[PDB]
Scaffold this active site. Structure first.
Site, PDB file in Angstrom:
ATOM      1  N   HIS A  37       0.820  -1.203   0.000  1.00 43.17           N
ATOM      2  CA  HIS A  37       0.000   0.000   0.000  1.00 43.17           C
ATOM      3  C   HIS A  37       0.861   1.262   0.000  1.00 43.17           C
ATOM      4  O   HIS A  37       0.379   2.349  -0.311  1.00 43.17           O
ATOM      5  CB  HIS A  37      -0.929  -0.006   1.212  1.00 43.17           C
ATOM      6  CG  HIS A  37      -0.216   0.094   2.525  1.00 43.17           C
ATOM      7  ND1 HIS A  37      -0.803   0.602   3.664  1.00 43.17           N
ATOM      8  CD2 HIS A  37       1.045  -0.254   2.876  1.00 43.17           C
ATOM      9  CE1 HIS A  37       0.066   0.563   4.659  1.00 43.17           C
ATOM     10  NE2 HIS A  37       1.193   0.045   4.208  1.00 43.17           N
ATOM     11  N   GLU A  61       1.486  -8.365   1.995  1.00 38.70           N
ATOM     12  CA  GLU A  61       1.941  -7.051   2.432  1.00 38.70           C
ATOM     13  C   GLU A  61       3.444  -7.057   2.702  1.00 38.70           C
ATOM     14  O   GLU A  61       3.935  -6.312   3.549  1.00 38.70           O
ATOM     15  CB  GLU A  61       1.189  -6.620   3.692  1.00 38.70           C
ATOM     16  CG  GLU A  61      -0.295  -6.382   3.463  1.00 38.70           C
ATOM     17  CD  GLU A  61      -0.917  -5.505   4.531  1.00 38.70           C
ATOM     18  OE1 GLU A  61      -0.350  -4.431   4.821  1.00 38.70           O
ATOM     19  OE2 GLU A  61      -1.970  -5.893   5.078  1.00 38.70           O
ATOM     20  N   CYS A 146       3.391   5.045   6.761  1.00 37.79           N
ATOM     21  CA  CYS A 146       2.896   3.675   6.795  1.00 37.79           C
ATOM     22  C   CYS A 146       3.947   2.715   6.253  1.00 37.79           C
ATOM     23  O   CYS A 146       4.727   3.070   5.372  1.00 37.79           O
ATOM     24  CB  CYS A 146       1.606   3.553   5.980  1.00 37.79           C
ATOM     25  SG  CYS A 146       0.101   3.516   6.981  1.00 37.79           S
TER      26      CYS A 146
END
Length: 188
Positions: A37, A61, A146
């Site tokens: 992401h 991820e 993030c």
């Protein structure tokens, strides 16, 4: 005598690298890590390394960055810990523009195989242990912090856990994106 709270490794802080909409880490001279992401859409090179000579490997991820050349700007070789036992205090490296380093802390939980988008992935949870920086999709991010890398002291060094994936409904609980490899097939 004088054990709790100590100076942090400098080179360890320089390893972190804010890329796109997240932060990564220097796994090694020619090796790097990053979330999914966090990866943006516009750049075609990192630290002067065109994608044409790079390798990518997603895994829940967890993307494996393999450069064709070893930049070795200030690294040597870090250790990767596929998760952590019960009672492992990890710390994230949140670097700012004005040098506002935000060293967060999280308590590791249990190791299990989660299911995301119909895909079983192995990851270790992590309850917040600072205040309430967690918003819902990370331990503590605001300007796009993030995917930040996790670190911890292991023996006579500091090992890296994973990256800032997201937070749970509890708020004070995030999931440490672990890598896939040994330990899953081994018996002990």
């Amino acid at each position: 005598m004088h054990h709790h709270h100590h100076h942090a490794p400098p080179t360890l802080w320089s390893r972190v690298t804010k890329f796109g909409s997240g932060w990564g880490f220097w796994v090694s001279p020619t090796v790097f890590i990053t979330t999914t992401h966090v990866v943006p859409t516009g750049v075609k090179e990192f630290f002067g390394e065109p994608l044409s000579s790079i390798a990518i490997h997603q895994a829940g991820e967890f993307t494996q960055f393999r450069f064709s050349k070893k930049m070795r700007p200030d690294l040597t070789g870090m250790v990767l810990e596929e998760g952590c036992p019960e009672g492992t205090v990890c710390s994230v490296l949140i670097k700012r523009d004005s040098g506002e380093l935000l060293p967060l802390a999280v308590r590791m939980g249990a190791i299990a195989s989660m299911r995301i988008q119909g895909r079983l992935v192995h990851g270790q949870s992590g309850m917040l242990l600072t205040g309430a920086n967690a918003k819902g999709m990370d331990l503590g991010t605001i300007p796009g912090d993030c995917g930040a890398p996790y670190v911890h002291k292991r023996g006579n060094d500091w090992v890296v856990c994973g990256v800032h994936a997201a937070a749970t409904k509890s708020g004070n609980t995030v999931v440490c994106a672990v890598q896939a490899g040994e330990g899953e097939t081994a018996l002990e």
